[PDB]
Amino acid sequence: TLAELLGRSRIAQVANNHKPLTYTGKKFHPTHQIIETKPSTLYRQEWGLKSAIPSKIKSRYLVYNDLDTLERITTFEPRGGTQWNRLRFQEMGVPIVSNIGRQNPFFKYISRPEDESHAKLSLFKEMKGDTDISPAAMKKRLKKITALIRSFQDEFKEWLVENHPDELKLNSNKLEDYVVKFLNKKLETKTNKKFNTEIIGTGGLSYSLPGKLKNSPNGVIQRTVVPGRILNVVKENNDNKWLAAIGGFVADVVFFQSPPSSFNSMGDFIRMKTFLFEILEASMEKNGSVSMHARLLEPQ
Template structure:
């Protein structure tokens, strides 16, 4: 095999298709997956063959793995079992929820002006109009300025044509910087930093200081479900999402592998019950939650919000420990089971619509 053959074999192998991990810590505390999850078919797993250089110990079995390196000088590849994040995603997919985001106005999964790869973050700094990050080092700024030697004279000329009043009368600092930004963004002769692919990747989990875009694209690959889908079940149309979870704090619950923020008022009863159960810890109780909202952040981590649901006979049990429901103490769960804030919102919308009708 000559070197060109080896070159092509490496280039086209599946092993080369594994992207560089975001961090060195395989099962660290990251809220997003950092390593490619690898599986192997059963016929290969019985021979402990995962397609990496060495075979792995038998204890790995049929598990999913991730690796930092496939071999080192000690013949001890840096490999660990890793499948948690995969199941987190699958559990979320099972709920049928749709992720919202607050970092773009438009749907990030469809092409539009502001979700191009080379669109820069809007941070309104002067460095930003030279295609630099707001935290760019002085060195980088100097090198760009050296490429634009007569920037000041050009700016003065531009001012003379477009805003001559700025030359005769004194102007405030903010106006001056606004004018400069406008000049830098409109003038074609200004040499800006050319965006490179390496600016977009995260080497060792850290984005370069000159990088322009630090955020995820789309939904970060988490969920591709779209709004407005009606879910049908044999019992009728499904409006809410109910999932089992455990209370792990006053305001947090663990649902489907995520720590979810819960409305404290809706879980008071459950919390009290679990806390006062003799010989039990609150984490030993599994209870239903209604997941209201899922939001994906700019870094790819997920924020979930849920309400506790009042259900089951134990909630209606009176203090005398009889099983007859004492309905005077606890209200039954609302069949519509939207939280108070949600209901208020829909009612508010109705009212607004009515008011609009009256005004027009």
């Protein structure tokens, strides 16, 4: 049918997005899907959207929100520059590593309940992970849940007197433990936030596995040298490290011992010059940012 075809169409494949096309806050990862048109289609203003893109647009990449609007225009920005940030990261050949030594999210590992010993930490995270929830929809998590949990009273009024009667007659320190486990055991079958929207690992920035060496005609590369730019002429206030702009990413640069004298000389125009850096490590934070650490390699 036409409905089945539409669901699989290339326009349907792009997930709905109404995020501001002009965002002036902190950008940590791509927010809009880049759309690309071939040169032949660009010559005919064809982008696979509802309407022809204005001929003024010479780029072959754009990002859009709405196919059409009440203003009879498409809401789009003729830019595709997050792809070059990803490709420049690939050229630096620095694998993303976990600073906490967690399991690789891209491998199906056999995990155990080692961290499941915090059942009361996360079972209540469902009601306590409400940092940005409505004052009454969050309050609907109190009566709606109370009835659901209160429907298991008979089950827990028999299991507890049949599996741990001593605790019911001695102390509740262990009873509370049996309660946290009971709900989770009766909730694993349930589907509360069965889909987790948190970023998985690198988020797609890099699928490179650590360990491989870079062979070169001049031997194996031991230190990665990448051109960059120093943004500030004074270390980040309250931090012992300056900031550099390397390959579309802002990194924290650690200097060997001293800061080169071009800093004082250049001053606030230090960003006008290019220095050579060494990328020590690259980490991923939960906000979806990349924590790139560099080192200002100076001619010596």
